Amino acid sequence: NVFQTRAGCLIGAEHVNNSYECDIPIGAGICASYQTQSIIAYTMSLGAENSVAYSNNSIAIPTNFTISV
Amino acid sequence: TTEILPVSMTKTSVDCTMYICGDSTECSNLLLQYGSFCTQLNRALTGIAVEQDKNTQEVFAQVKQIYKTPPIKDFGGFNFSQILPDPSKPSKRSPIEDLLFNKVFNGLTVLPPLLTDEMIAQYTSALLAGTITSGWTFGAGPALQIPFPMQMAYRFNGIGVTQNVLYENQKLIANQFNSAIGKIQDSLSSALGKLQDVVNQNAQALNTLVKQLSSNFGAISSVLNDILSRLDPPEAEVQIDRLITGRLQSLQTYVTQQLIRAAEIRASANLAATKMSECVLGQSKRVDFCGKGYHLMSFPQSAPH
Amino acid sequence: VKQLSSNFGAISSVLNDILSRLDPPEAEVQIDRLITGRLQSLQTYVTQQLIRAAEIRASANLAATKMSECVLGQSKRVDFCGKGYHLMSFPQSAPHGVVFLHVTYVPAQEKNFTTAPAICHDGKAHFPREGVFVSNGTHWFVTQRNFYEPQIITTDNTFVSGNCDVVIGIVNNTVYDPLQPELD
Ligand SMILES: *[C@@H]1O[C@H](CO)[C@@H](O[C@@H]2O[C@H](CO)[C@@H](O)[C@H](O)[C@H]2NC(C)=O)[C@H](O)[C@H]1NC(C)=O
Ligand SMILES: *[C@@H]1O[C@H](CO)[C@@H](O[C@@H]2O[C@H](CO)[C@@H](O)[C@H](O)[C@H]2NC(C)=O)[C@H](O)[C@H]1NC(C)=O
Ligand SMILES: *[C@@H]1O[C@H](CO)[C@@H](O[C@@H]2O[C@H](CO)[C@@H](O)[C@H](O)[C@H]2NC(C)=O)[C@H](O)[C@H]1NC(C)=O
Ligand SMILES: *[C@@H]1O[C@H](CO)[C@@H](O[C@@H]2O[C@H](CO)[C@@H](O)[C@H](O)[C@H]2NC(C)=O)[C@H](O)[C@H]1NC(C)=O
Ligand SMILES: *[C@@H]1O[C@H](CO)[C@@H](O[C@@H]2O[C@H](CO)[C@@H](O)[C@H](O)[C@H]2NC(C)=O)[C@H](O)[C@H]1NC(C)=O
Ligand SMILES: *[C@@H]1O[C@H](CO)[C@@H](O)[C@H](O)[C@H]1NC(C)=O
Numbered sequence: 001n002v003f004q005t006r007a008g009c010l011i012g013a014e015h016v017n018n019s020y021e022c023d024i025p026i027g028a029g030i031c032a033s034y035q036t037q038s039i040i041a042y043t044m045s046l047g048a049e050n051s052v053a054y055s056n057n058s059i060a061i062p063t064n065f066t067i068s069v
Numbered sequence: 070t071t072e073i074l075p076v077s078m079t080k081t082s083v084d085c086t087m088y089i090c091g092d093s094t095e096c097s098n099l100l101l102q103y104g105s106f107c108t109q110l111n112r113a114l115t116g117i118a119v120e121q122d123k124n125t126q127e128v129f130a131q132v133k134q135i136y137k138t139p140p141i142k143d144f145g146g147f148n149f150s151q152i153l154p155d156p157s158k159p160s161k162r163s164p165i166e167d168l169l170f171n172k173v174f175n176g177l178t179v180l181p182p183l184l185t186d187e188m189i190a191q192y193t194s195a196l197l198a199g200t201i202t203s204g205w206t207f208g209a210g211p212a213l214q215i216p217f218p219m220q221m222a223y224r225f226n227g228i229g230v231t232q233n234v235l236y237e238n239q240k241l242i243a244n245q246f247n248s249a250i251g252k253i254q255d256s257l258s259s260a261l262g263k264l265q266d267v268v269n270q271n272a273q274a275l276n277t278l279v280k281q282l283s284s285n286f287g288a289i290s291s292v293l294n295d296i297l298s299r300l301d302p303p304e305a306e307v308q309i310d311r312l313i314t315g316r317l318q319s320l321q322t323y324v325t326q327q328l329i330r331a332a333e334i335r336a337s338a339n340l341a342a343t344k345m346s347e348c349v350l351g352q353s354k355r356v357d358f359c360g361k362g363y364h365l366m367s368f369p370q371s372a373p374h
Numbered sequence: 375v376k377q378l379s380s381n382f383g384a385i386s387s388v389l390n391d392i393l394s395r396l397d398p399p400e401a402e403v404q405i406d407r408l409i410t411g412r413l414q415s416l417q418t419y420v421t422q423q424l425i426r427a428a429e430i431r432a433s434a435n436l437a438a439t440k441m442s443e444c445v446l447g448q449s450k451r452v453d454f455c456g457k458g459y460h461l462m463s464f465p466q467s468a469p470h471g472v473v474f475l476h477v478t479y480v481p482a483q484e485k486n487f488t489t490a491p492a493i494c495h496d497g498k499a500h501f502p503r504e505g506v507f508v509s510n511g512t513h514w515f516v517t518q519r520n521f522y523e524p525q526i527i528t529t530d531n532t533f534v535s536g537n538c539d540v541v542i543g544i545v546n547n548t549v550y551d552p553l554q555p556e557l558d
Contacts (some may be wrong), residue, residue, distance in 0.1 A: 009524075011535040023392050028375065032545065034449060053486075056543075057488055057489055057490065058486060058487070058489065059488075059489040059506065059508065060484040060485065060486060060487075061484060061487060061506075061508065061517060061519070061521075061522045062481035062482055062483060062484045062485075062520065062521065062522065063482075063483045063484070063485055063521075063522045064481075064482040065479055065480060065481050065482050065521070066479075066480045066482050067461075067477065067478075067479065067480075068456070068457070068477070068478045068479075068480050069457055069475055069476065069477050069478075
């Protein structure tokens with residue numbers, strides 16, 4: 001219902017706990033979006049996480065390619 | 070060496086009516102006779118407050134994944150501990166990102182930026198873990214790991230030295246690098262004038278805007294509750310218009326100089342976005358574009374703006 | 375256009391009706407407020423056109439530089455001509471602009487291998503001429519760095535510099551010389 005951000009007071013949007021890509025910027029890290037059917041407000045996500053299998057004698061070499069336009 | 074660049078400035082909004090009249094229906098009705106000047110001023114300020122977030126998005130969101138560095142960190146003798154994130158610190162910043170964050174009413178509001186400082190420090194740590202661990206491969210596709218000294222040997226090839234010159238001088242090259250990263254920390258801990266100047270200019274302009282709410286411009290006072298108390302309505306119109314004209318002039322001067330200052334911040338952020346592409350996700354051959362000498366590699370660090 | 379219908383504190387917005395109602399002695403009063411307001415309108419329009427033309431000029435200079443460096447050549451600047459290793463670009467015209475079609479190469483389907491900086495053979499350190507030493511688990515090859523294409527390590531794709539006691543990570547393997555089985 002009523003949710004307090006750092007951008008101000010927001011009425012009419014539910015505060016979910018998951019993080020999506022930003023859809024409508026609210027500010028100070030919060031975005032809003034029409035999901036499912038209702039309007040939700042969330043902290044944006046920067047992207048998916050990734051650890052690289054770094055070691056001191058390992059290398060990754062590609063075996064194919066794509067042409068991109 | 071270091072290079073400092075401004076990417077953003079502060080997003081401000083004004084409310085024309087509350088600045089010129091200050092919640093008084095007499096002034097507000099006279100103001101309607103001036104047309105739509107105060108919808109234009111707001112359109113201009115909104116257009117420059119949206120591009121401040123566009124400026125940051127194009128310098129820092131240059132990754133798809135958020136890369137993390139390995140727990141056991143053996144990079145051939147090279148030591149990146151003063152530029153890698155520190156969990157016991159505020160906002161999970163690096164040690165050198167902290168020294169940088171420590172060195173630098175009436176219709177007026179300040180809007181917050183869309184990306185917090187935590188998010189931008191996250192972006193720079195993903196760039197920095199991508200380059201320590203994959204070289205320049207993650208800026209062209211999927212990140213492919215390579216040992217750090219073999220990456221250093223490829224970069225030596227890129228400036229026209231052979232690889233045995235790196236492999237036979239590994240410990241000396243690593244000691245020189247560590248000792249030279251140790252001096253950035255002293256020289257800063259003991260220089261951010263380009264970032265300080267854009268803060269100062271904006272504050273000096275916002276203060277001049279408010280200090281104009283106390284000039285007569287050729288009227289009996291500067292207060293509307295004083296012209297509405299010792300003048301009858303036919304005589305207070307002539308005195309209110311003299312204030313309206315002056316305050317409109319001052320607000321529009323403020324809005325022109327902000328357009329001219331934002332067009333300059335925009336070019337700086339456009340250069341920072343090109344340096345992030347060409348010095349951090351690549352090795353540049355352009356002379357004096359990524360330092361002075363022969364470019365080997367570059368590391369980003371976030372600063373206040 | 376729409377600011378032509380404000381009074382700016384006069385009796386009428388239409389000067390034909392300003393000259394119809396208040397005349398010369400008083401038109402020097404009512405016509406002057408219209409002149410003052412309309413002049414300011416026009417000046418705001420011209421200043422904001424000058425600031426916007428300077429932004430269009432920066433864009434057109436960048437598009438000229440991309441036409442020279444992406445269509446009339448092959449660029450090495452990362453991200454200047456699309457994401458990936460630039461191969462070529464084609465221009466297309468648009469209503470007030472230009473569309474560049476960037477063709478790039480994107481590597482795919484990477485595999486894991488074991489690496490070494492140098493090979494040790496006969497008390498000598500061998501380095502690849504252009505590539506990397508890789509192991510499939512049991513055998514050592516040289517390959518080019520962007521496409522997997524393994525070859526035998528010979529004295530024609532390596533060079534020698536020093537002993538195998540100074541470089542950190544040498545492995546022991548054999549460097550095949552073609553000439554010897556040639557002349558027996
Ligand atoms: C990388 O360099 C840092 C120095 O900035 C080393 O960390 C410090 O080393 C001194 C000397 O032993 C200690 O007194 C500090 O407590 C260390 N930690 C700090 C200052 O946070 C670090 O050990 C080096 N890394 C390696 C692998 O040698
Ligand atoms: C190269 O080997 C590493 C390490 O063996 C692989 O890293 C794996 O990554 C996954 C992530 O989904 C982890 O869950 C595994 O624990 C890691 N180790 C494994 C599978 O042994 C990496 O995927 C390999 N790279 C390629 C291209 O096959
Ligand atoms: C690594 O590659 C080598 C050479 O490509 C493999 O050795 C050959 O494997 C084939 C399998 O059919 C045999 O017929 C050959 O006799 C082998 N020796 C040669 C060509 O000299 C080896 O099996 C590969 N190792 C792994 C773990 O895949
Ligand atoms: C690369 O890292 C590996 C593992 O971290 C190193 O292997 C270690 O080598 C030391 C001395 O050579 C041994 O005392 C350790 O027991 C080894 N670790 C394991 C898990 O076996 C290796 O030396 C490093 N350097 C290279 C490969 O050049
Ligand atoms: C690689 O082979 C060399 C010999 O060609 C080995 O060198 C010997 O190393 C032992 C132990 O360090 C010494 O006692 C011998 O005197 C060395 N002999 C020579 C001719 O140098 C070396 O140990 C081997 N290393 C590996 C990893 O296989
Ligand atoms: C969101 O997650 C936090 C976890 O700390 C929890 O306390 C909170 O109740 C959650 N809110 C909703 C709406 O699920």
